[PDB]
């Protein structure tokens, strides 16, 4: 969770380069000229009348390297190395066409970063999974639809292939991984029909809040009971919080309530 780049705006690499390599008198992030001394007044007047032209090459390269840092194509500690290498290359092949290409690349990378600021793996997994079963092609179809809906609506969830099996993980740094291949292999003999492994039990518990299934089928009954259990768990959490907060005006009290409550 460390800041990838120094600038206050993680996106807009041009803005980040503005923040890093520009004087803090032109920037904006949100006196009495005439009483100033003669030297300052004359310097400001001359600079205003005849503005000093400067090369926007180092700024462009800094914006590019900030974009690369944001994209993670360049590690944090080699930013200076890449900056110097890019400056050397640009100076070696400097031209108006090269400057135009640099500006175009900065604009394109800024747009791409702004636009950007698992599904294909699930599609491949569904493709390798058989789509026809001899025990009702509606429970399977609705379950697949629920799985796709939940993986799409999950904020940070990953589906990936690890050798010969496909896995589903609820979060990047979590501890809830479901072997989808084995779960569906276990579920296949009993679509339309205690005997389920913990992997497929966890899959069902995860998909229950995000699910068309006919209630007559075994999977329908299991999903209804899992929904009921999850609702009981939420209401039990609310009751536990209320009881504990009231009883704290003892860890032994938490022990007693949890034991009586589970």
């Amino acid at each position: 969770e460390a800041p990838r780049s120094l600038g206050p705006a993680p996106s807009n690499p041009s803005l980040q380069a503005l923040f890093q390599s520009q004087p803090s008198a032109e920037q904006e992030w949100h006196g009495d000229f005439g009483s100033q001394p003669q030297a300052n007044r004359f310097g400001a007047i001359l600079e205003a009348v005849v503005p000093p032209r400067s090369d926007p090459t180092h700024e462009k390269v800094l914006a590019i390297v900030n974009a690369l840092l944001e994209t993670q194509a360049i590690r944090r500690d080699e930013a200076g190395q890449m900056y110097t290498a890019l400056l050397q290359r640009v100076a070696r092949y400097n031209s108006v066409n090269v400057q135009g290409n640099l500006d175009r690349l900065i604009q394109d990378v800024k747009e791409a970063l702004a636009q950007r600021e698992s599904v294909v793996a699930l599609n491949a997994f569904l493709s390798t999974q058989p789509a026809v079963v001899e025990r009702g092609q509606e429970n399977y179809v609705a379950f697949v639809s629920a799985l796709k809906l939940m993986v799409t609506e999950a904020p940070q969830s990953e589906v990936y292939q690890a050798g010969p099996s496909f896995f589903f993980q609820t979060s990047r740094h979590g501890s809830q991984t479901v072997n989808l291949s084995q779960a569906f292999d276990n579920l296949r003999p009993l679509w339309g029909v205690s005997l389920l492994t913990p992997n497929t039990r966890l899959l069902l518990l995860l998909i229950a809040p995000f699910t068309g299934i006919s209630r007559d089928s075994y999977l329908g009954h299991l999903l209804t009971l899992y929904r009921e259990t999850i609702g009981n768990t939420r209401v039990d959490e609310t009751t536990y919080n209320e009881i504990t907060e009231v009883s704290r005006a003892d860890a032994s009290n938490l022990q007693a309530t949890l034991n009586y409550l589970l």
Partner: protein, 51 residues
């Protein structure tokens, strides 16, 4: 003696078959095989480093 020679008492004890006991109980008493602690959440659900 009437012609004694001062004093310097020193005391000691001598246990000859005893294992010193420090039970893992809140009040140091034995109210069962399982103790007041040990089945507590703090000492049953979390790992601790004894020193």
């Amino acid at each position: 003696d009437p012609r004694h020679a001062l004093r310097d008492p020193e005391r000691k004890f001598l246990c000859d078959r005893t294992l010193w006991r420090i039970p893992f109980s809140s009040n140091f008493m034995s109210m069962g095989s399982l103790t007041d602690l040990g089945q507590n959440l703090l000492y049953a659900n979390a790992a601790h480093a004894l020193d």
